[PDB]
Design an enzyme around this catalytic site. Structure first.
Site, PDB file in Angstrom:
ATOM      1  N   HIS A  27       0.813  -1.222   0.000  1.00  0.00           N
ATOM      2  CA  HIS A  27       0.000   0.000   0.000  1.00  0.00           C
ATOM      3  C   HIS A  27       0.842   1.265   0.000  1.00  0.00           C
ATOM      4  O   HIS A  27       0.396   2.303  -0.502  1.00  0.00           O
ATOM      5  CB  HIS A  27      -0.989   0.043   1.167  1.00  0.00           C
ATOM      6  CG  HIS A  27      -1.987  -1.082   1.159  1.00  0.00           C
ATOM      7  ND1 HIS A  27      -3.349  -0.877   0.999  1.00  0.00           N
ATOM      8  CD2 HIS A  27      -1.815  -2.424   1.280  1.00  0.00           C
ATOM      9  CE1 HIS A  27      -3.971  -2.041   1.030  1.00  0.00           C
ATOM     10  NE2 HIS A  27      -3.065  -2.992   1.211  1.00  0.00           N
ATOM     11  N   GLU A  48       6.008  -2.916  13.420  1.00  0.00           N
ATOM     12  CA  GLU A  48       5.655  -1.509  13.314  1.00  0.00           C
ATOM     13  C   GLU A  48       5.782  -0.758  14.632  1.00  0.00           C
ATOM     14  O   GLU A  48       6.121   0.454  14.640  1.00  0.00           O
ATOM     15  CB  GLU A  48       4.265  -1.327  12.756  1.00  0.00           C
ATOM     16  CG  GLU A  48       4.134  -1.581  11.267  1.00  0.00           C
ATOM     17  CD  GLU A  48       3.982  -3.070  10.873  1.00  0.00           C
ATOM     18  OE1 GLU A  48       3.776  -3.952  11.749  1.00  0.00           O
ATOM     19  OE2 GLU A  48       4.055  -3.346   9.664  1.00  0.00           O
ATOM     20  N   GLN A 111      -7.017  -5.490   4.162  1.00  0.00           N
ATOM     21  CA  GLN A 111      -6.445  -4.426   5.005  1.00  0.00           C
ATOM     22  C   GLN A 111      -7.232  -3.096   5.103  1.00  0.00           C
ATOM     23  O   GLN A 111      -6.729  -2.107   5.667  1.00  0.00           O
ATOM     24  CB  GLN A 111      -4.980  -4.175   4.657  1.00  0.00           C
ATOM     25  CG  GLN A 111      -4.164  -5.462   4.600  1.00  0.00           C
ATOM     26  CD  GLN A 111      -2.803  -5.230   4.071  1.00  0.00           C
ATOM     27  OE1 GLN A 111      -1.956  -4.584   4.728  1.00  0.00           O
ATOM     28  NE2 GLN A 111      -2.554  -5.751   2.854  1.00  0.00           N
TER      29      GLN A 111
END
Ligand SMILES: Cc1ncc(C[n+]2csc(CCOP(=O)(O)OP(=O)(O)O)c2C)c(N)n1
Ligand SMILES: Cc1ncc(C[n+]2csc(CCOP(=O)(O)OP(=O)(O)O)c2C)c(N)n1
Ligand SMILES: Cc1ncc(C[n+]2csc(CCOP(=O)(O)OP(=O)(O)O)c2C)c(N)n1
Ligand SMILES: [Mg+2]
Ligand SMILES: [Mg+2]
Ligand SMILES: [Mg+2]
Lengths: 553, 553, 553
Positions: A27, A48, A111
């Site tokens: 993305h 993350e 997602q």
């Protein structure tokens, strides 16, 4: 013709950003491609959360904007702990996230379909989703302005896959400069006067620095103001490194050791709080550190913080850096300041006394006392070192040796008190410390290091020479103490961690692994790791039973 | 032993509040009882929306904190439009709301079970629900600090019925003072210098004031700064009244009439924006009012606003009032300023030319032109009058006569553009105007007056001598214009209002009612109502077809 | 080539909607143009709140979807109270709102920049902003499915100006049908059996209907079920009209009169709750209406509601309509049901006794008793009339005469308890009643009518023959009672309304205005208004001192 991803990176370049911290996703691949083309490194992690904490670390240790970069969905949701931490810590991070394509919104696709802006709203200064590729530059720049201005904090910019991949003709959209003054606003001359008049007629005045002093880093101003007035200076954890450049006789150290002053008949007369909020680190409204009997001058960029938990004498809303500057300027034109040599010696003597007190009750009869362990770390701390602290008992002990040393950086838990935050934080800090010539040391607990232990791989891939010191007491320590102290001796459950060779984990990741259980073995290990331009893990066997002074509080 | 309601009122007293605006409910009756005991008037309306807008009007016209008081549930939900308006308008209102008792939470009971804090979060500086009676004073004061500091804005304090009724021993909880400096932060000396240097070397400089200049009301500082520099001054609607004390030769008026400057070869050289944001009132990023070719100095308390739609030369985050003060101080120590007499005359002549241009095309061949109607109002406007404007076409016309007069207050739509907001606004304004000896005139549309027409009752009950002037064009006017202009002559639907004697409605509510259809009949009516210490409604039959210059834009 | 507005209307057409309720704005004019083209009437009001409540009223009285249409900014915020009311009331309304263009997002422009979706999220089943014109049909239809399925509730669709005006080629986007079964889910056969077994072996069984019985309107099924079992049936306000088709001997009436049953030795043995939640109308967890000693069978579409405040015997999650059907089917195949004639008479006698009790203490020695007033309304109530009730004391009194009559509709406050909601509600209901041949009566308070008094204009413009009856006790009545009762005789503040001729306001708006102060004058007035196909206002002077039985509770 260029991509929205290009637009992001071109704006980031113009803002002066030189590093991003992220984890890849399709993305957000247009941002990766752009950074590759422009030679902008993205430090890619194994989680993350570690990426977000690196962005914080980079910001906190370099006094810079940190930029975090995450993909849609789980990319974003794994970043939430960093965002919340930065929110409570007043730390300036741009969190850039992908999200589902706006075309094909609400198609139950991969997602997509979580309201990421809604989730971040409660814990960001600003959180917003971009609706058009053309808006990218002005919105990135707006987000950065919000991040960097007082009080500093996190911002979430949500960039749909759609919006990023779409192509526009460069030269139809202008990339703005960052046009935002670097000097903050300062108090009205009449408030400054009153503040200075109160400071001048005080018998036992004291300054307390908080995070905003650190973010603005007005070192030469601070030290001119302190040199003119001779007023001793304390800090919460985040402000501590701002004491590193001051003359010794006015380094009060960490605010905590203000604790015993009342019972010594030396409770401060007046306290000048410069971004230090009433709360956890300053003893809430209890008056145990900031006495109820003292006149308080509070300078904060948020009016809400002004006397939140306690009566104050003077409430100034202004930037902390701008204020420090103004105090220096007014104070260069002054030079009629009472001595304060006696008061400073008293401050010094109290801090010193607490230290020797602690030292008088610490051992190795078959096991290494956490205080002794902290001392071993202390002898390596100076301006060429950033210390990052994690893990409850570990940092409550460490804190006792932090006041007499002068770190280039000290990055400890803020209000969030979230175990595990340290690893990512230290990795970001080391990136920032590379341009400044500093070594980053992480001091963490055996519990906390498990949160992000995979980052050892990142240290080796990226060749970041972080030293990770694990105070290993075979348990979630503070939390085991709570059970014994608040419930009873045999009420210990889910708090023991009697397993796992942490140095072996680091070794299996390519990092140098040491295990030590003694003053002398640890000393040799830390020295050897400092000598190597190489990441390392030092697994320190440390005693669990001792209770740090700060814990009883 | 005293109630949570007592605690609220005692804290409001110490903050210096003297009026609240609300609508009663059982949930908040402890606040009523307390206000009754302390002689604090609650101006009770016929709709919580009107109450909320009154709080705005009181704040906007008095440059004070406004305080709104509503009950749980529908009480709160009716208040939402005022909250949003204040949010976009940077107006300081404390919204105090009841909610369901915390005990018996989640019992499907009367007026409970809507997350009022969640609803207000997107449009408040702070929104929070009080969890303990003891917290009432420190939280009320914290809410007031947030409301009052830059940029100003609404705050929602949710007080559970539980928490309000519960009794504690006074003297176990301290009521804080409002300790918050009244002078805002000001720019760094180096930014001020640079600003002044740029201002000194400009050929056609211009100042544009926005809402924050108005909230801080630094009238004597502004006029000393303008007197020293001779720089002409414009304002958006909210800033307009700040121009009432300046010398005529530097009154540029409303920013809109900066429109024709480019085509006259007189596009400003430099623009000093003091709290005037890039947005609706300043022509967005179009450069039609703030030229792209001009150097812009922007001063705003929110760094986001700095160059949000357009490149700027100098971006200063500071308080506008403090900035104005600093410019006066720096400028008293100066007195080497270039003439600007020619430039000011040019500014003057352009404004005057637009006016005469409009005047040259306005009629009464069987019907009264909205411009001629606005002129009739204009001849009564001076420092003893607050003008409140509502209703689209009404105010776009009114705006053309507002630059050459010098109102004590001018309260118009902000970014929200919410029709009907005017009535409650003017009611609050009139309350504030009573201490200052001013009269409030509301100028509104026949559409917009219907939103709050019941407030005529409140005017009569409370003896507030507001004059309500209805520009009656038998329609939702601007909105009908849009249909003809953007869709076609016979595409008018849902926009006509060919019914209803509005003066009759006022009469039936006990207010003096007039109906007029002419320059001379309106003139007589307005003069007669101004002569009476009595509320009034003047129903003005006005033409619909004319298009105000601002509409074509 | 067609507009997004066309797309909206075409999808609404296919869903079967025949009326919208709104207030015009430029942002949503494409929807107006489309409706004009397709002959779909938009009933335009004088306030968005009124429009929203009309949508509710139309849905609640017609057992239909209601559709509300408001513009960006203030248009949306004024709709918030209807949204919240529908949320607590489980009423199916599609709220369609304008919002700022997505292009020029974040430009500080007119009516933009409030997070409308965030505001509605806490009080909608679904709230969403449309990102592409092509998505309009599937998203409108999705929104409608969410609104209409169990438990019913409001939905917000936010349609940017951008998205609506933009044009696409029709025949590139398909308009879906509403494909969603009209028969709700029903219980498992084993749960049904167990329910029926318990119902069969009960001595004093009782059924209580809630809003979901009303939304699905399975009248013929209900009455076959009730006829087979002879089990008496009660309802909360919203369920009441579902009792209008049942045989008299099993009409228990409003649940409230279940109150005195315990102390009569007749506390129900078993209660079958069909969409009736534990909460305000059913006496919470107190067991004053739904005894603790009773076996409870609860059928609700939301599992959360199942025994939320009180232990139950059997918890079924299913649709109420489907369940009623299943009970009728199982019960057509049964016909071995114990008599219950004695128990039904007892139910009847208790309700009757409460009524006669109240009647024995009501007067006119110089003033008209609210009970006597309600009785005058009662004699006109039958299947050809929808009653809408507002205003506290007004409806607590009105409720005592509602059990013995059989209204086609009864629309009263739900959990929100928001004063003023009645006016728009009745207006929507009257639109729905026009196809069904019914008359709508609004019975409201002098306080409450002030909230939407302008809608008298809408009644006249649209020729809706609503009769608005104002119980005028010169005060916010229940609220004044609370002060005297809970605080003291001389603690009355901000609760009086001793001003204003409401009939005059209606007359000034073109509606027939009456004022009455007596059994005989009111009787004549109501009869005369019922005889005219004309909207009316009946201002009823009514006594304030009497306390309705429901108030003491
Ligand atoms: C994310 C998170 N999880 C759990 C806790 C609760 N907690 C407070 S102290 C502590 C653990 C201490 O662990 P360790 O890293 O071993 O440090 P020690 O106290 O042993 O030095 C825990 C679990 C927390 N504050 N944050
Ligand atoms: C609350 C709200 N509803 C609808 C609109 C859309 N709108 C733009 S102009 C206008 C109305 C103007 O009517 P009136 O009050 O009579 O003033 P006029 O233009 O007729 O002089 C409306 C409704 C809005 N901006 N706010
Ligand atoms: C919107 C709203 N405002 C205020 C209240 C609190 N309240 C309880 S009843 C009532 C007023 C009674 O109104 P009115 O129409 O005069 O009823 P009555 O006098 O017939 O009791 C009020 C204000 C509420 N529940 N909702
Ligand atoms: Mg440990
Ligand atoms: Mg009009
Ligand atoms: Mg009443």
């Amino acid at each position: 013709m260029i991509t929205g991803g290009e637009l992001v990176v071109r704006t980031l370049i113009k803002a002066g950003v030189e590093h991003l911290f992220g984890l890849h996703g399709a993305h957000i691949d247009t941002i990766f491609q752009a950074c590759l083309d422009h030679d902008v490194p993205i430090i890619d992690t194994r989680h993350e959360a570690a990426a977000g904490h690196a962005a914080e670390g980079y910001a906190r240790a370099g006094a810079k904007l940190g930029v975090a970069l995450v993909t849609a969905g789980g990319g974003f949701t794994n970043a939430v702990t960093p965002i919340a931490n930065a929110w409570l810590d007043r730390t300036p991070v741009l969190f850039l996230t992908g999200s589902g394509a706006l075309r094909d919104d609400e198609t139950n696709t991969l997602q997509a379909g979580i309201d990421q802006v809604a989730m971040a709203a409660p814990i960001t200064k600003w959180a917003h989703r971009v609706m058009a590729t053309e808006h990218i530059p002005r919105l990135v720049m707006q987000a950065i302005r919000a991040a960097l201005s007082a009080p500093r904090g996190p911002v979430l910019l949500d960039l749909p896959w759609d919006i990023l991949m779409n192509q526009i003709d460069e030269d139809s959209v202008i990339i703005p400069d960052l046009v935002l003054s670097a000097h903050g606003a300062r108090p009205d001359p009449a408030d400054l006067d009153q503040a200075l008049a109160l400071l001048r007629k005080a018998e036992r005045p004291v300054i307390v620095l908080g995070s905003e002093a650190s973010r603005t880093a007005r070192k030469t101003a601070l030290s001119a103001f302190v040199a003119a007035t001779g007023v001793p200076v304390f800090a919460d954890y985040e402000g501590l490194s701002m004491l590193s450049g001051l003359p010794d006789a006015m380094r009060g150290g960490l605010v905590q050791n203000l604790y015993s002053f009342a019972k010594a008949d030396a409770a401060p007369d007046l306290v000048l709080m410069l971004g230090a909020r009433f709360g956890l680190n300053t003893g809430h409204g209890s008056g145990q550190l900031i006495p109820h009997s003292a006149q308080v001058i509070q300078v904060d960029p948020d009016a809400c913080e002004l006397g939140r938990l306690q009566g104050i004498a003077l409430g100034i809303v202004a930037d902390v850096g701008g204020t420090i500057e103004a105090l220096a300027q007014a104070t260069a034109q002054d030079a009629a300041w009472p001595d304060r040599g006696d008061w400073c010696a008293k401050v010094t003597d109290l801090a010193q006394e607490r230290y020797a007190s602690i030292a008088a009750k610490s051992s190795s009869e078959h096991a290494l006392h956490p205080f002794h362990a902290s001392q071993v770390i202390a002898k390596h701390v100076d301006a060429g070192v950033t210390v990052v602290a994690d893990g409850a008992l570990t940092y409550l002990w460490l804190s006792e040796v932090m006041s007499r040393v002068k770190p280039g950086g000290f990055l400890c838990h803020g209000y969030l008190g979230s175990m595990g935050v340290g690893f990512g934080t230290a990795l970001g800090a080391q990136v920032a410390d590379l341009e400044a010539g500093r070594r980053t040391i992480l001091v963490t607990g055996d519990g906390s290091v498990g949160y992000s232990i995979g980052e050892f791989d990142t240290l080796v891939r990226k060749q970041l020479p972080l030293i990770v010191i694990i105070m290993n007491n075979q348990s979630w320590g503070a939390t085991l103490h709570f059970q014994q102290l608040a419930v009873g001796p045999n009420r210990v459950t889910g708090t023991r961690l009697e397993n796992g060779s942490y140095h072996g984990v680091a070794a299996a990741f390519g990092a140098d692994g040491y295990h030590v259980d003694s003053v002398e073995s640890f000393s040799a290990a830390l020295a050897q790791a400092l000598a190597h331009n190489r990441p390392a893990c030092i697994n320190v066997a440390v005693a669990l039973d001792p209770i740090p002074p700060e814990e009883l509080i």
